[PDB]
Amino acid sequence: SDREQLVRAASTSLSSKIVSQYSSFLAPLAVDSVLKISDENSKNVDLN
């Protein structure tokens, strides 16, 4: 869990999406969603 690498990679991955201007609060949104499920086996992290 790293707030520097995950947030900067999430906002960059948006790129031309319309949410790029809204990426300020949206970048921590996608990071904190995945951090709730953590495993050392590198599971696919089901999005259900």
């Binding site: 790129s15 031309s16 319309i18 790029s20």
Partner: protein, 44 residues
């Protein structure tokens, strides 16, 4: 040196492969404008 070995026959596959590449690159040209942060949306 020529007139020996073999001669290429049924050259239509050579044209079919060209027709498939040209048709595939034509589709890749429309999506190319959407690449990168400077890309634009496509309304369908």
């Amino acid at each position: 040196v020529p007139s020996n070995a073999t001669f290429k026959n049924k050259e239509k596959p050579q044209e079919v492969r060209k027709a498939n590449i040209i048709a595939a690159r034509s589709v890749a040209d429309a999506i190319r404008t959407s690449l990168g942060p400077k890309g634009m949306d496509k309304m369908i």
